[PDB]
Motif scaffolding. Sequence first.
Motif, PDB file in Angstrom:
ATOM      1  N   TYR A  23       1.003  -1.198  -0.228  1.00 61.53           N
ATOM      2  CA  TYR A  23      -0.011   0.011  -0.166  1.00 61.53           C
ATOM      3  C   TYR A  23       1.116   1.176  -0.062  1.00 61.53           C
ATOM      4  CZ  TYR A  23      -3.000   3.709   1.412  1.00 61.53           C
ATOM      5  OH  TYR A  23      -3.682   5.020   1.527  1.00 61.53           O
ATOM      6  N   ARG A  24       1.731   1.296   0.903  1.00 62.00           N
ATOM      7  CA  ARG A  24       2.800   2.455   0.954  1.00 62.00           C
ATOM      8  C   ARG A  24       3.614   2.713  -0.103  1.00 62.00           C
ATOM      9  NH1 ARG A  24       6.777   3.551   5.935  1.00 62.00           N
ATOM     10  NH2 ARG A  24       7.564   1.558   5.268  1.00 62.00           N
ATOM     11  N   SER A  25       3.797   1.541  -0.879  1.00 60.85           N
ATOM     12  CA  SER A  25       4.572   1.649  -1.978  1.00 60.85           C
ATOM     13  C   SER A  25       3.808   2.522  -3.004  1.00 60.85           C
ATOM     14  CB  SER A  25       4.748   0.283  -2.652  1.00 60.85           C
ATOM     15  OG  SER A  25       5.594   0.293  -3.866  1.00 60.85           O
ATOM     16  N   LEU A  26       2.544   2.123  -3.212  1.00 56.49           N
ATOM     17  CA  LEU A  26       1.777   2.915  -4.421  1.00 56.49           C
ATOM     18  C   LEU A  26       1.309   4.287  -3.998  1.00 56.49           C
ATOM     19  CD1 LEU A  26      -0.765   2.394  -3.289  1.00 56.49           C
ATOM     20  CD2 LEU A  26      -1.138   0.258  -5.120  1.00 56.49           C
ATOM     21  N   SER A  27       1.114   4.378  -2.511  1.00 53.88           N
ATOM     22  CA  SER A  27       0.496   5.460  -1.991  1.00 53.88           C
ATOM     23  C   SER A  27       1.702   6.546  -1.878  1.00 53.88           C
ATOM     24  CB  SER A  27       0.185   5.494  -0.489  1.00 53.88           C
ATOM     25  OG  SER A  27       1.071   5.388   0.464  1.00 53.88           O
ATOM     26  N   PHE A  28       2.929   6.245  -2.049  1.00 52.65           N
ATOM     27  CA  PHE A  28       3.967   6.960  -2.208  1.00 52.65           C
ATOM     28  C   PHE A  28       4.150   7.786  -3.536  1.00 52.65           C
ATOM     29  CE2 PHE A  28       7.256   8.458   0.742  1.00 52.65           C
ATOM     30  CZ  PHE A  28       8.116   8.993   0.060  1.00 52.65           C
ATOM     31  N   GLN A  29       3.124   7.497  -4.191  1.00 53.39           N
ATOM     32  CA  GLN A  29       3.305   8.058  -5.781  1.00 53.39           C
ATOM     33  C   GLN A  29       1.685   8.759  -6.050  1.00 53.39           C
ATOM     34  OE1 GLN A  29       5.181   3.713  -7.009  1.00 53.39           O
ATOM     35  NE2 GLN A  29       3.898   4.812  -8.478  1.00 53.39           N
ATOM     36  N   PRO A  30       1.930  10.080  -6.041  1.00 58.48           N
ATOM     37  CA  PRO A  30       0.707  10.906  -5.883  1.00 58.48           C
ATOM     38  C   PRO A  30      -0.332  10.756  -6.964  1.00 58.48           C
ATOM     39  CG  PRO A  30       2.840  12.019  -5.363  1.00 58.48           C
ATOM     40  CD  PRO A  30       3.208  10.780  -5.683  1.00 58.48           C
ATOM     41  N   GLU A  31      -0.024  10.348  -8.300  1.00 55.96           N
ATOM     42  CA  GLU A  31      -1.082   9.890  -9.299  1.00 55.96           C
ATOM     43  C   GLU A  31      -2.043   8.773  -9.028  1.00 55.96           C
ATOM     44  OE1 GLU A  31       2.063   7.095 -10.963  1.00 55.96           O
ATOM     45  OE2 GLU A  31       2.069   8.931  -9.889  1.00 55.96           O
ATOM     46  N   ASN A  32      -1.301   7.778  -8.088  1.00 60.22           N
ATOM     47  CA  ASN A  32      -1.894   6.802  -7.415  1.00 60.22           C
ATOM     48  C   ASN A  32      -2.604   6.996  -6.398  1.00 60.22           C
ATOM     49  OD1 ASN A  32      -0.362   4.924  -9.380  1.00 60.22           O
ATOM     50  ND2 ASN A  32       1.038   4.477  -7.937  1.00 60.22           N
ATOM     51  N   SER A  33      -2.322   7.695  -5.335  1.00 61.38           N
ATOM     52  CA  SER A  33      -3.048   7.927  -4.123  1.00 61.38           C
ATOM     53  C   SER A  33      -4.160   9.014  -4.588  1.00 61.38           C
ATOM     54  CB  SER A  33      -2.002   8.904  -3.157  1.00 61.38           C
ATOM     55  OG  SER A  33      -1.759  10.041  -3.579  1.00 61.38           O
ATOM     56  N   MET A  34      -4.339   9.589  -5.691  1.00 61.88           N
ATOM     57  CA  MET A  34      -5.345  10.361  -5.897  1.00 61.88           C
ATOM     58  C   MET A  34      -6.305   9.609  -6.703  1.00 61.88           C
ATOM     59  SD  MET A  34      -4.603  13.025  -9.298  1.00 61.88           S
ATOM     60  CE  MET A  34      -2.920  13.381  -8.861  1.00 61.88           C
ATOM     61  N   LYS A  35      -6.590   8.316  -6.795  1.00 62.90           N
ATOM     62  CA  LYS A  35      -7.402   7.680  -7.406  1.00 62.90           C
ATOM     63  C   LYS A  35      -7.962   6.985  -6.203  1.00 62.90           C
ATOM     64  CE  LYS A  35      -7.081   8.107 -11.794  1.00 62.90           C
ATOM     65  NZ  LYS A  35      -6.242   9.456 -11.405  1.00 62.90           N
ATOM     66  N   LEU A  36      -7.411   6.975  -5.053  1.00 64.26           N
ATOM     67  CA  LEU A  36      -8.111   6.322  -4.170  1.00 64.26           C
ATOM     68  C   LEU A  36      -9.227   7.285  -3.346  1.00 64.26           C
ATOM     69  CD1 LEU A  36      -4.865   5.148  -2.105  1.00 64.26           C
ATOM     70  CD2 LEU A  36      -6.258   3.666  -3.691  1.00 64.26           C
ATOM     71  N   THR A  37      -9.846   6.895  -2.174  1.00 64.45           N
ATOM     72  CA  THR A  37     -10.573   7.536  -1.493  1.00 64.45           C
ATOM     73  C   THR A  37     -10.356   8.184  -0.024  1.00 64.45           C
ATOM     74  OG1 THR A  37     -11.756   5.667  -0.185  1.00 64.45           O
ATOM     75  CG2 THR A  37     -12.469   5.772  -2.428  1.00 64.45           C
ATOM     76  N   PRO A  38     -11.065   9.056   0.211  1.00 60.75           N
ATOM     77  CA  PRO A  38     -10.374   9.798   1.616  1.00 60.75           C
ATOM     78  C   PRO A  38     -10.582   9.058   2.728  1.00 60.75           C
ATOM     79  CG  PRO A  38     -11.858  11.403   0.417  1.00 60.75           C
ATOM     80  CD  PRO A  38     -12.079  10.013  -0.313  1.00 60.75           C
ATOM     81  N   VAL A  43     -10.095   5.552   2.688  1.00 61.39           N
ATOM     82  CA  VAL A  43      -9.149   4.621   2.427  1.00 61.39           C
ATOM     83  C   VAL A  43      -7.788   5.130   2.965  1.00 61.39           C
ATOM     84  CG1 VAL A  43      -7.416   3.560   0.613  1.00 61.39           C
ATOM     85  CG2 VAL A  43      -9.768   3.000   0.518  1.00 61.39           C
ATOM     86  N   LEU A  44      -7.380   6.599   2.604  1.00 55.36           N
ATOM     87  CA  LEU A  44      -6.128   7.611   2.748  1.00 55.36           C
ATOM     88  C   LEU A  44      -6.037   7.208   4.319  1.00 55.36           C
ATOM     89  CD1 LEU A  44      -6.150  10.021  -0.008  1.00 55.36           C
ATOM     90  CD2 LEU A  44      -4.271   8.316   0.524  1.00 55.36           C
ATOM     91  N   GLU A  45      -7.341   7.542   5.204  1.00 57.87           N
ATOM     92  CA  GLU A  45      -7.357   7.643   6.530  1.00 57.87           C
ATOM     93  C   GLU A  45      -7.037   6.521   7.232  1.00 57.87           C
ATOM     94  OE1 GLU A  45     -10.543   8.163   9.208  1.00 57.87           O
ATOM     95  OE2 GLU A  45     -10.403  10.310   8.885  1.00 57.87           O
ATOM     96  N   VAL A  46      -7.725   5.284   6.779  1.00 55.06           N
ATOM     97  CA  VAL A  46      -7.509   3.950   7.607  1.00 55.06           C
ATOM     98  C   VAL A  46      -6.049   3.490   7.094  1.00 55.06           C
ATOM     99  CG1 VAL A  46      -8.156   1.657   7.450  1.00 55.06           C
ATOM    100  CG2 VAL A  46      -9.783   3.606   7.461  1.00 55.06           C
ATOM    101  N   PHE A  47      -5.798   3.309   5.868  1.00 52.74           N
ATOM    102  CA  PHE A  47      -4.616   2.702   5.429  1.00 52.74           C
ATOM    103  C   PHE A  47      -3.372   3.406   5.423  1.00 52.74           C
ATOM    104  CE2 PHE A  47      -7.246  -0.628   4.571  1.00 52.74           C
ATOM    105  CZ  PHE A  47      -7.569  -0.898   3.287  1.00 52.74           C
ATOM    106  N   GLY A  48      -3.604   4.670   5.620  1.00 51.29           N
ATOM    107  CA  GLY A  48      -2.454   5.666   5.788  1.00 51.29           C
ATOM    108  C   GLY A  48      -2.296   6.888   4.618  1.00 51.29           C
ATOM    109  N   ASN A  49      -2.051   7.913   5.157  1.00 53.42           N
ATOM    110  CA  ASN A  49      -1.970   9.154   4.216  1.00 53.42           C
ATOM    111  C   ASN A  49      -0.519  10.108   4.285  1.00 53.42           C
ATOM    112  OD1 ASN A  49      -2.968  11.070   2.257  1.00 53.42           O
ATOM    113  ND2 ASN A  49      -3.441  12.242   4.216  1.00 53.42           N
ATOM    114  N   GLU A  50       0.456   9.208   4.688  1.00 57.10           N
ATOM    115  CA  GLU A  50       1.812   9.744   4.519  1.00 57.10           C
ATOM    116  C   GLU A  50       2.346   9.910   3.004  1.00 57.10           C
ATOM    117  OE1 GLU A  50       1.642   6.983   3.540  1.00 57.10           O
ATOM    118  OE2 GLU A  50       3.478   5.894   4.238  1.00 57.10           O
ATOM    119  N   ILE A  51       1.385  10.429   2.207  1.00 61.60           N
ATOM    120  CA  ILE A  51       1.458  10.636   0.786  1.00 61.60           C
ATOM    121  C   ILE A  51       2.252  11.922   0.571  1.00 61.60           C
ATOM    122  CG2 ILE A  51      -0.312   9.062   0.152  1.00 61.60           C
ATOM    123  CD1 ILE A  51      -1.762  11.572  -0.751  1.00 61.60           C
TER     124      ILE A  51
END
Lengths: 242, 11
Positions: free
Chosen positions: A217-232, A234-242
């Motif tokens: 998760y972190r791997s792809l969340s550390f990539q802005p174009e990917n983390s913006m395809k997620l939901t708010p 998901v970012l809260e629960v799984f992590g948002n240190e993007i």
Amino acid sequence: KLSEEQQHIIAILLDAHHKTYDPTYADFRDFRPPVRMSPLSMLPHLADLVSYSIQKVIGFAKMIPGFRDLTSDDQIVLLKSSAIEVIMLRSNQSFTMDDMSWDCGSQDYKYDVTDVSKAGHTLELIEPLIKFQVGLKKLNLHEEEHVLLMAICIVSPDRPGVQDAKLVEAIQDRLSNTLQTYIRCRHPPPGSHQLYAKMIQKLADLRSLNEEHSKQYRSLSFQPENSMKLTPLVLEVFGNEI
Amino acid sequence: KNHPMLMNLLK
Ligand SMILES: CC(=O)O[C@@H]1CC[C@@]2(C)[C@H](CC[C@@H]3[C@@H]2CC[C@]2(C)[C@@H]([C@H](C)CCC(=O)O)CC[C@@H]32)C1
């Protein structure tokens, strides 16, 4: 044999489940459309599905007898760490060994290896995940056992960040003994053979799957174009240190 | 630790 309390707990978990897991998957129409072009083509749809599923796991968790006596802090810790696990667990209901896929009533909503691999995660996760499904499927659990496992999975005292572990532990043992007793009094042999040991082992498989999930998760969340395809959520629960 | 959405869905 069983117990009035234990039968009470079982009755509540079954209903809580029926209220949070829709066998018709009618709500799947609302998700961003699935695209089977990693191409990440599936990320928008599976992200919504997961996000939606987090909301349902929370709804189920609230009905877990005793979960309400916990503080918010503990409730939040328990859900943040168990969500993905419970989602993989509850997904067993839709998983079929016929073609090794999650058949969610509809061809568009029928997911297999190549679909779930198109959301930014590798086989290092997907491989063990399907294996898990098969092994869990092969247990042919009673639905009573199924919900007890999801509940036990949620209220685990060893999750990082737990405060009142004793209370969490008390709540879980109550569920465990309910499970152990139900298997003994309601699950006939041979299918009852080492069933509790095989279900607790699946809780260990989930930790492993959870761990791998956090890593990818972190791997792809550390990539802005990917983390913006997620939901708010998901970012809260799984992590948002993007 | 500051999860308004989760917190809100839990209450
Ligand atoms: C935000 C994020 O990045 O979410 C990831 C999206 C890809 C992936 C690989 C990881 C691991 C969990 C997987 C998910 C794909 C869809 C699955 C296979 C769900 C089933 C379709 C559920 C069926 C059901 O509800 O019965 C349950 C387990 C889910 C989460």
